[PDB]
Design a protein around this ligand. Sequence first.
Ligand SMILES: CCCCCCCCCCCCCCCCC[C@@H](O)O[C@H](CO[C@H](O)CCCCCCCCCCCCCCC)COP(=O)(O)OCC[N+](C)(C)C
Ligand SMILES: CCCCCCCC/C=C\CCCCCCCC(=O)O[C@H](COC(=O)CCCCCCC/C=C/CCCCCCCC)COP(=O)(O)OCCN
Lengths: 83, 69
Amino acid sequence: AGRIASFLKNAWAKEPVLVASFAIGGLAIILPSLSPYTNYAIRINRATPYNYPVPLRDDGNMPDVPSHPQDPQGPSLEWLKNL
Amino acid sequence: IARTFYDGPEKNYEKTMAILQIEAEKAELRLKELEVRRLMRARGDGPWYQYPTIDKALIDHSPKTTPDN
Ligand SMILES: CCCCCCCCCCCCCCCCC[C@@H](O)O[C@H](CO[C@H](O)CCCCCCCCCCCCCCC)COP(=O)(O)OCC[N+](C)(C)C
Ligand SMILES: CCCCCCCC/C=C\CCCCCCCC(=O)O[C@H](COC(=O)CCCCCCC/C=C/CCCCCCCC)COP(=O)(O)OCCN
């Protein structure tokens, strides 16, 4: 507790560049795992339609697939507009 | 001497018969195995000499961004 205190004191006095570098690196490593928005970034990446959405052949047993884009079934991007 | 140190001729006789049967079976088995190896290496239909091909489980059967694969 007091060993590391004087150690960080001497480091801030002699090598502030290395101190700032290790602080920034450690923050970059640990902060992304505590964030509620990392999942938002994954979802944003998943919602980007790079290729054509190929339709499915209706067999009468697909209650949760839309038959027109403006039908209520399927994924919604409403969460994204309010983001 | 014959009573104390040796046996009758039938023992050696029939032991020889057993030995001969074992050896002749081993000989025909060796020849048959050579023939089976020749056929399995030439035809590739046997369990032996199976050379790997590509696992069909690696193929991706999903729509491929263009209709003609
Ligand atoms: C009567 C007087 C005039 C005639 C003399 C006759 C001469 C005969 C004596 C010579 C001895 C023969 C030489 C031994 C060779 C035989 C070895 C072997 O074949 O014998 C085994 C049998 O073992 C015998 O005991 C042989 C042992 C002989 C060892 C000789 C050692 C002598 C050294 C002398 C030391 C004396 C004291 C020293 C003082 C310092 C057989 O094994 P086994 O699994 O049964 O086979 C199955 C047969 N069955 C079914 C009948 C049982
Ligand atoms: C977990 C984070 C990892 C990712 C971030 C880091 C990425 C890049 C930064 C690291 C680059 C490599 C650093 C190499 C270290 C070299 C050490 C060294 O030998 O240099 C010392 C100088 O540095 C030292 O004193 C040795 C180490 C002392 C401590 C240095 C920093 C250690 C960590 C400090 C901060 C701890 C974490 C941050 C907390 C901030 C407070 C909230 C000697 O200086 P000279 O150039 O030889 O001088 C010649 C003339 N006399």
